[PDB]
Design an enzyme around this catalytic site. Structure first.
Site, short mmCIF file in Angstrom:
data_model
loop_
_atom_site.label_atom_id
_atom_site.label_comp_id
_atom_site.label_asym_id
_atom_site.label_seq_id
_atom_site.Cartn_x
_atom_site.Cartn_y
_atom_site.Cartn_z
N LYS A 1 42.20 77.23 43.48
CA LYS A 1 44.17 77.20 42.94
C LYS A 1 44.28 78.57 42.11
O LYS A 1 44.04 79.16 41.43
CB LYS A 1 44.17 76.45 41.30
CG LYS A 1 44.92 76.02 41.04
CD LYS A 1 44.61 75.22 39.26
CE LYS A 1 45.23 77.25 38.65
NZ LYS A 1 46.71 77.20 38.69
N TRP B 1 48.76 85.95 39.51
CA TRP B 1 50.08 85.60 40.15
C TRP B 1 50.18 87.09 40.88
O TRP B 1 51.04 87.38 41.78
CB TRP B 1 51.53 85.24 39.24
CG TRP B 1 51.20 85.92 37.83
CD1 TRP B 1 50.90 85.27 36.77
CD2 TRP B 1 51.93 87.00 37.57
NE1 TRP B 1 51.38 86.18 36.10
CE2 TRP B 1 51.56 87.43 36.04
CE3 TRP B 1 52.26 88.38 38.12
CZ2 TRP B 1 51.90 88.66 35.64
CZ3 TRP B 1 52.62 89.22 38.19
CH2 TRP B 1 52.28 89.56 36.16
N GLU C 1 47.19 94.32 25.89
CA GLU C 1 48.21 95.08 27.99
C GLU C 1 48.89 93.80 27.40
O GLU C 1 48.85 92.80 27.86
CB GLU C 1 46.55 93.26 28.03
CG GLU C 1 47.17 94.31 29.68
CD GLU C 1 45.83 92.93 30.66
OE1 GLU C 1 45.27 92.23 30.99
OE2 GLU C 1 46.09 93.68 32.22
N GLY D 1 47.83 75.47 35.48
CA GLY D 1 46.30 75.29 35.09
C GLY D 1 46.96 74.85 33.58
O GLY D 1 45.96 73.80 33.81
N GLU E 1 50.15 79.26 39.58
CA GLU E 1 51.17 77.96 40.23
C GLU E 1 52.45 78.73 40.76
O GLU E 1 53.54 77.85 41.16
CB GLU E 1 51.44 77.52 39.01
CG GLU E 1 51.66 78.05 37.51
CD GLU E 1 50.45 78.10 37.34
OE1 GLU E 1 49.52 78.89 37.38
OE2 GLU E 1 50.54 77.92 35.55
N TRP F 1 32.86 95.80 41.01
CA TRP F 1 34.65 95.38 40.51
C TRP F 1 33.97 94.67 39.02
O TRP F 1 33.34 93.55 39.56
CB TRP F 1 35.58 95.70 40.97
CG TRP F 1 36.87 95.20 40.32
CD1 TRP F 1 37.09 94.41 39.48
CD2 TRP F 1 37.36 96.80 40.61
NE1 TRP F 1 38.57 94.67 38.96
CE2 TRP F 1 38.75 95.93 39.25
CE3 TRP F 1 37.28 97.78 40.15
CZ2 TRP F 1 39.58 96.75 38.62
CZ3 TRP F 1 38.75 98.67 39.62
CH2 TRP F 1 39.42 97.75 38.49
N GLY G 1 40.60 83.25 30.26
CA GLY G 1 38.99 83.14 30.00
C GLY G 1 38.28 82.45 29.22
O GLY G 1 37.47 82.11 29.52
N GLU H 1 36.87 87.27 34.96
CA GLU H 1 37.06 89.79 35.46
C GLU H 1 38.57 89.11 34.52
O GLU H 1 39.67 88.01 34.95
CB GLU H 1 37.52 89.59 37.14
CG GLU H 1 37.04 89.37 37.60
CD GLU H 1 35.58 90.77 37.92
OE1 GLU H 1 36.80 91.75 37.52
OE2 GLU H 1 34.80 90.77 38.37
N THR I 1 43.11 82.03 40.71
CA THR I 1 43.32 83.13 40.50
C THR I 1 45.04 83.92 39.87
O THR I 1 45.40 82.65 39.25
CB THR I 1 44.09 83.98 41.53
OG1 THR I 1 44.14 82.57 43.09
CG2 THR I 1 42.46 84.06 42.35
N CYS J 1 45.31 94.95 36.97
CA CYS J 1 44.70 95.02 35.69
C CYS J 1 44.18 96.15 35.38
O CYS J 1 43.97 96.25 34.02
CB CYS J 1 43.77 93.95 36.55
SG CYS J 1 42.82 94.35 38.01
N1 LIG Z 1 39.39 91.98 36.18
C1 LIG Z 1 40.22 92.26 37.18
O1 LIG Z 1 40.20 92.30 38.45
C2 LIG Z 1 41.77 91.50 37.37
C3 LIG Z 1 42.54 91.92 38.39
C4 LIG Z 1 44.00 91.10 38.57
C5 LIG Z 1 44.19 90.76 36.72
N2 LIG Z 1 43.68 90.36 36.23
C6 LIG Z 1 43.90 89.83 34.95
O2 LIG Z 1 45.17 89.00 35.16
C7 LIG Z 1 46.11 88.26 34.12
C8 LIG Z 1 47.30 88.15 34.62
O3 LIG Z 1 47.86 87.06 35.07
P1 LIG Z 1 48.12 85.97 34.70
O4 LIG Z 1 49.31 85.98 33.91
O5 LIG Z 1 48.76 84.26 35.50
O6 LIG Z 1 46.66 85.21 34.12
P2 LIG Z 1 46.37 83.21 32.90
O7 LIG Z 1 44.95 83.35 32.57
O8 LIG Z 1 48.31 83.93 32.28
O9 LIG Z 1 46.41 82.59 34.48
C9 LIG Z 1 45.67 82.97 35.53
C10 LIG Z 1 45.08 81.84 36.38
O10 LIG Z 1 44.83 80.69 35.67
C11 LIG Z 1 45.24 79.16 35.20
N3 LIG Z 1 45.19 78.35 34.31
C12 LIG Z 1 46.25 78.70 32.79
N4 LIG Z 1 45.50 77.73 31.65
C13 LIG Z 1 44.30 77.55 31.98
C14 LIG Z 1 42.75 76.84 31.73
N5 LIG Z 1 43.19 75.72 31.02
N6 LIG Z 1 42.27 76.00 32.81
C15 LIG Z 1 42.08 76.77 34.32
N7 LIG Z 1 43.31 77.58 35.29
C16 LIG Z 1 44.32 78.06 34.08
C17 LIG Z 1 46.75 79.83 35.85
O11 LIG Z 1 46.99 78.49 36.70
C18 LIG Z 1 46.50 81.03 36.49
O12 LIG Z 1 46.49 80.36 38.30
C19 LIG Z 1 45.70 89.53 33.03
O13 LIG Z 1 45.49 89.85 32.03
C20 LIG Z 1 45.49 90.84 34.21
O14 LIG Z 1 45.24 91.84 33.36
C21 LIG Z 1 42.32 90.75 36.14
#
Ligand SMILES: NC(=O)c1ccc[n+]([C@@H]2O[C@H](COP(=O)([O-])OP(=O)(O)OC[C@H]3O[C@@H](n4cnc5c(N)ncnc54)[C@H](O)[C@@H]3O)[C@@H](O)[C@H]2O)c1
Lengths: 496, 496, 497, 501
Positions: free
Chosen positions: B180, B156, B390, B213, B183, B456, B238, B255, B154, B289
């Site tokens: 997880k 933050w 974004e 991550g 962080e 969703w 992703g 997502e 997830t 998001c």
């Molecule tokens: N589509 C939706 O339903 C939805 C909902 C809320 C937020 N978001 C999106 O989430 C993003 C914001 O969150 P963020 O900055 O924490 O995203 P991020 O990709 O920067 O990090 C998200 C998670 O991925 C983990 N991570 C990082 N590198 C990884 C790896 N190599 N392998 C596995 N996990 C790893 C992190 O520890 C963290 O828990 C924005 O793009 C936002 O639009 C989407």
């Protein structure tokens, strides 16, 4: 030979039969005698891109995506009627190209007809759902839309069958598609495109690219305008495809290989178990994704079973697919036969025994063809490569098991999980076993039964997603939640 | 502050709260004042692996996967009751960690309760289907089984909300999971694990890993024992995850982000459009998001709308989330605020105008916090990065459109497709538009409405798969076709 | 004359108020163990029934419940489920006191009832209709599920609260308004559940409880024009009457009637298991069960051996008070019902059958004052006899032989009914073949009496119309509406301008 | 022209179809079939007895139990229903002419039916192998729970005279798709197309006893079809009084029922509606097939602000409606079905005048020379009426409409629902949000927004209140022909040991 005089030799892009952009070509072989029987275009990556852009333009114009589902159904149905009308020629054409027996090919044409017929009838049956909204004064609905542009890639073992599984739902749902069959077996796929053209579809809705995966495959999986990649093939290629599709977060449907167990208990109908073991291992020279290459027989009847099986294997009639006597044809290519031969070396090296076969037949009438003897491998265990990896040839391995739990443990000790079977007259036991097997399809006292009405696909590394049945259709659909507020009010969170 | 005295500081693996394998730790920040408020374990990749192996052992023992669906439902329901019981403390904790207003946090706790309650009730409702077999003397059935071991990751912005969406179905279906959280925001996630432990689950069924991550993420997406990776985060992460998951052909649910259009026609309820535009752009400092960062307003009212919007933006109350006056809190971190600041430079450089905001507030009471002024960007077009990418901050862009077709073209001119809205008193028009928008969720005369009853997710690069609703549950299920031949006969294909 | 009753209402519940009968008439409630009056309740009039129905209509139209969100409706049904569990003990004792069955059998009901309310609570917000792919261009086609409206619910005396739960849960989950009337002779638990539902809180008029004889107020509940659905669980002759009356205003119906449920036993069945379940099927609640296995069909090769084993076991069945742990079978419900059973023994003897054991009232001292009747086994009978074709609904079973599998099926289906049945055999393949050919709503393989909220229950043939429980159960309380919008309307210009 | 019409009859059977054989009435009695355009006898058919009906039912039972159709694979059953669909399309022309000849409606209206009928058979053909039940997650450990959908058994099907083949298609398709055996009886006065479709179904090929056709008066053989004990379902489409009678009779053997009865269908027109569209569809709703449609928009509700303007526009258009022979392209409205029915309509004009209403136009037989010999009746508009009147509450089922005013949206809803019926209705307004609010409050099985008469196989059709019980078409339509069975297997059976040893 007659079949080929009026058959197109070209790709079908954006409503026109057209050559490769560089006019390059490829020779198609008949595995029975290794003779060149036909020459087709060998497309470029620019051709693939042009087809994809054509599918996009067509999808966006809405001529097919906005057609009524009912009508889309009628057209898919028209395709089904064409398969039946040209059943004979199609069957011969598939036997000529892939080498399998004519009866096996007639069976495909019957399945293919039913595949198109099934999806034709499924087209107008579910357009989404109405939700009971937890918010007052709101209407909530989910609408199913075609996913968009889809790329479809098939293998060489059952070319038209695997194509039917992808084309039918894509068309039924309103998607635009770009199909690319195995470079070495494009004959029936070309024919079906000729037939689909006769049925009539909007320009760009259907496209056929001909060529090597190493050349145009990356475009089909990685181009940004693709919304879904439906692939049926080898595991190593599937991984490559998934990785490439990730560049534009593109959906994927993967139908990969298997190490399918054929579990035989001592309370099984013995002669039935032997019959189906032979069938599971040698139909189409074991070049079947659902092949029962991993036989698991209960210790109390293992010796007896190994003898019965081996004797039957020695009598298997090899020959030309067009010849009624023929029970097993040749393998598809020199490259594939060599892959199988190298597995025999691997098996011997790791301690297994080649109880029968394991070589090319030297019989005079078979010398010129790509034949390989039906083989039985004994004295092997789960730690060996010959048991864990998909050989995809006329080869089976035999392993013993003492108890029901041990049979399950072994059947599941594999990276795969596509299909398998259980033989026993104790139906209650067979049921218990079936529930514990991590396999997409489980047959009880039977083998190879698949049909459009039920989803097919794998657990674990045999794939991602499903084909056939309602779930098959779903890969070609995307959900949209439209929520209308019938009495909108300001929230007034921020100051005025 | 009281909340934290009894809160665990550790990971939860295989039924025990345990420290990092190397005893390393991390400091958690409160974005309002940038002070360290709590210290937690910083797990290693070996800890992640151990949790995954634990989830597998648990899944295979069947203590949870073989429990009755009805009971599983009762336990998920018990978790829902715990969210409501500790609603107050959880809300404060989330506001403390993420910085958003307390009312926004209370709202989450209400949604989370309903999310668990929805899946609790869905658990025992569909265990598969019976098929009308096309083959006589056969029984065909499809059974739905839990997919197996699932890893959940997830972001933050809404830590517990995003977790609830993954945990509820995993547990309802019988899967074992390893979660997880970001962080930098693990507080509420740790708390919910304490609550789930109270409810009682078999050893290994639930596991919590805490860490970066970049350190443990690869294990969670690439370990072979994982059957599904459910990820909610940034697009670049992703893609990385999908590529890594491909190594063991592992299913994925993604997502990702959005560039969500907020379309406003001249026949819209003007004051309503303005209210919701502010909401869409500035709730949780635009760190949503589904944020309506791309405003599309019809030319005939563009000038009038830009003025109204800008005036309201100047009055937005910034401050501490625990303070009732506060309308918008700070952004999550120094790193994130800097990403936002660099976007203002990008926008100015490519010709756009910063009509209001675009800087840190220098007001005395906000100087120590990670605040950033609500911003409105004008004189921009679809070719600019500020409009396509974004930003995920308190920033919105305003673009004009002449006709309905032009509004649609622009709304879809983006790599994303998560959510959007349409404002107009002409409901028929809003409906036409909604049907043409390639978005997972479309609101008509509203914004931000999501709920457990409806799926969703995104179209295009906003994701793969769905969360919430029946489809949400299906990501955690796999289909098996069990076909029994009730009157087996030998095929007699091969010689006797 | 126990504790449970001192705080229990003695009245009807109409339009949010506990109220007496319009003519202040009353009825005495009996405890079949000793035939003593244990409680006195109101005996409503037909005008009271009409007033409740009109109240249900007014409430339905106001939309306070029918327009509530499904999610919330679910939470309230869930609250009722929690109340059943909270008062599990008292409810179980109350049901045992009123109906006479053993306490453990009552505890089991309370567990089912809780799960029944819980199931429907979770089903409430899951399906609000469907979107159709319209065959006409420029149109939107959708099907919306709406609560059917006002529903009347009528239950029997054997399992009063269980049968009520099966009707109340879906009616409330869907948004309907209801008027319930339990068997005039067993209203105790039904009154209690209304007290509990009132505590949960529902809009005025949403739920109503009428107390009285079917012959008096039943016709209003089935024939009033404002009723949109009659859900009835009872005897076949009453069901027919109800259907005929409902036809006056073309009113939907759901009927759960009787059965002549076969218990088929093959020679390859687990013998001791077959005997155990045959006893269970025939004598639980003194055979006063709609799913009772009163028609035993045993394969000729083991018929004699099975008849002996069964008869010996029957002779050892402990009869007594439901509150007593030793008790295995309680009394029958009333003097009338016991007489009906006694007259069947005369019928059986007269048509040639044999009363192998039982068939009389026990004269044991401690049972003389109660409405007891000995567990009975009838032999040397065939399908042409009334004792085999008709529902006795007492502690009575008939034993018939069969040579082959086809003959077992033919006999099992040679009946006007089709509610439920069982098949015992270690050959699961065979049991499956048989199950597919039995015209029965529920078929058990190597088990008996298993029903649950997750699956629909009801009959084939004359055992009923419609279904209860499962998704289909919910559907009886819903009506479909097709809303078709033309997004680009054009004149048809069929007629001259 | 009409000639191709009379040719049709030289090869058409004149008999009932029972147990695989075309056979006469048991007493050789017969009936004359009329062409309402000129009242001439155009064909003579058998008039079955109640013993013939019983024999057909027993035949359907024997067939159902043998399993030749009920145990065939759903996929194959689908292919056969599809073959019937293809036959409708192949003989589309002849069937359409035959229906126009028998019922009197225009040829284009008949072509439309044949297109629908083809799609009806096609829809159910594709639905046949799609849902055979469900697997349940059992709350009891060591048990397997599954629900199997089986054909209900023997079904009797009874249709009206307005749209004979269309109403038959709605019953036959699902019965056959599911594996049921059926006995159909069309309106005694319009059996032509029904006989033809049986000839076509016979060509397709079905097991002996699977399909049966009884010809005769309802008063004579109807009771056997609803009350015989071997019937598992009675699917009826007709008048309310007959439906009640049927339900009462079916109760004797607790027999399932599906009833599609009449309607008093509102056509609600707001002042913000597309005026010319509202007028077009009001005419359509009231006069297609001389208002002999169950979904007919006989109750027009127009908003007071445009009531006067609307009444005039409507009346003018009504005066120009071309009456004539159905085979003549100029014809916009044909005759009513029979002398008995025209008299029923005429007596309603007396009723209306007597209770205070006004016959604004029509309300009489036309005396034009070319129409004198036919069963014509002028399109009629009734004004100055209110909800308390019989002319407004009862189904006239003729070329007649009533006009009522309403001030507000709530008043429109109240009036639209002030009726014993609830089959279908429409709402006209450019304010789609308002139309949606109204549609949600109308107790009607089908609601059209800015349209009229749109029905199709993909969606269920039926009524709320007294317009019926059950549904036809769509997935729900199929379900009337299915029954659920819960098979529960205990995979680890244990003794309960409740009783002593
Ligand atoms: N589509 C939706 O339903 C939805 C909902 C809320 C937020 N978001 C999106 O989430 C993003 C914001 O969150 P963020 O900055 O924490 O995203 P991020 O990709 O920067 O990090 C998200 C998670 O991925 C983990 N991570 C990082 N590198 C990884 C790896 N190599 N392998 C596995 N996990 C790893 C992190 O520890 C963290 O828990 C924005 O793009 C936002 O639009 C989407």
């Amino acid at each position: 030979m007659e079949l080929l005089k009026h058959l197109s030799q070209r790709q079908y892009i954006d409503g026109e039969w057209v050559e490769s952009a560089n006019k390059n070509t490829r020779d198609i072989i008949n595995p029975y005698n290794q003779e060149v029987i036909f020459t087709v275009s060998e497309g470029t990556k620019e051709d693939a891109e042009r087809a994809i852009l054509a599918a996009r333009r067509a999808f966006e114009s809405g001529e097919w995506s906005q057609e009524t589902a009912e009508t889309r159904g009628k057209k898919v149905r028209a395709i089904a009627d064409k398969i039946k009308e040209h059943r004979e020629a199609l069957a011969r054409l598939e036997t000529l190209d892939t080498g399998k027996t004519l009866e096996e090919s007639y069976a495909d044409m019957d399945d293919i007809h039913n595949v198109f017929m099934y999806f034709a009838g499924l087209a107008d049956k579910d357009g989404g759902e109405m939700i009971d909204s937890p918010i007052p004064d709101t209407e909530s609905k989910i609408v199913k839309e075609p996913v968009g542009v889809v790329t479809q890639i098939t293998p060489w073992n059952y070319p038209l069958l695997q194509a039917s599984w992808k084309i039918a739902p894509a068309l039924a749902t309103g998607c635009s598609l770009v199909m690319k069959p195995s470079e070495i077996t494009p004959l029936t796929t070309i024919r079906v495109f000729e037939l689909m053209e006769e049925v009539g579809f909007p320009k760009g809705t259907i496209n056929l690219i001909l060529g090597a995966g190493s050349e145009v495959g990356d475009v089909m999986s990685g181009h940004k305008e693709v919304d879904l990649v439906s692939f049926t093939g080898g595991i190593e290629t599937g991984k490559h495809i998934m990785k490439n599709a990730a560049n534009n977060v593109t959906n994927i449907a993967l139908e990969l290989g298997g190490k399918n167990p054929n579990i035989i208990f001592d309370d099984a109908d013995f002669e039935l178990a032997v019959d189906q073991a032979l069938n599971g291992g040698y139909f189409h020279a074991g070049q079947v994704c659902s092949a029962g290459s991993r036989i698991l027989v209960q210790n109390s009847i293992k010796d007896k079973f190994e003898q019965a099986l081996i004797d039957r294997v020695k009598k298997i009639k090899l020959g030309n697919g067009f010849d009624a006597d023929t029970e097993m044809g040749p393998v598809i290519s020199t490259e594939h036969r060599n892959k199988i031969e190298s597995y025999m070396d691997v098996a011997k090296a790791e301690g297994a025994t080649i109880a029968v076969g394991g070589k090319r037949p030297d019989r005079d009438d078979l010398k010129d063809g790509l034949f390989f003897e039906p083989t039985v491998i004994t004295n092997c265990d789960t730690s060996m490569r010959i048991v864990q990896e998909e050989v995809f040839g006329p080869v089976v391995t035999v392993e013993g098991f003492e108890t029901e739990q041990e049979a399950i443990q072994l059947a599941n000790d594999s990276i795969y999980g596509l299909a398998g079977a259980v033989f026993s007259k104790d139906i209650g036991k067979a049921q218990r076993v079936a529930n514990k097997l991590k396999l997409g399809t489980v047959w009880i006292n039977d083998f190879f039964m698949y049909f459009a009405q039920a989803p097919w696909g794998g657990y674990k590394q045999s794939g991602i997603g499903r084909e056939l049945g309602k779930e098959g259709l779903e890969e070609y659909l995307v959900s949209k939640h439209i929520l209308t507020n019938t009495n909108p009010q300001l929230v007034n969170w921020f100051s005025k």
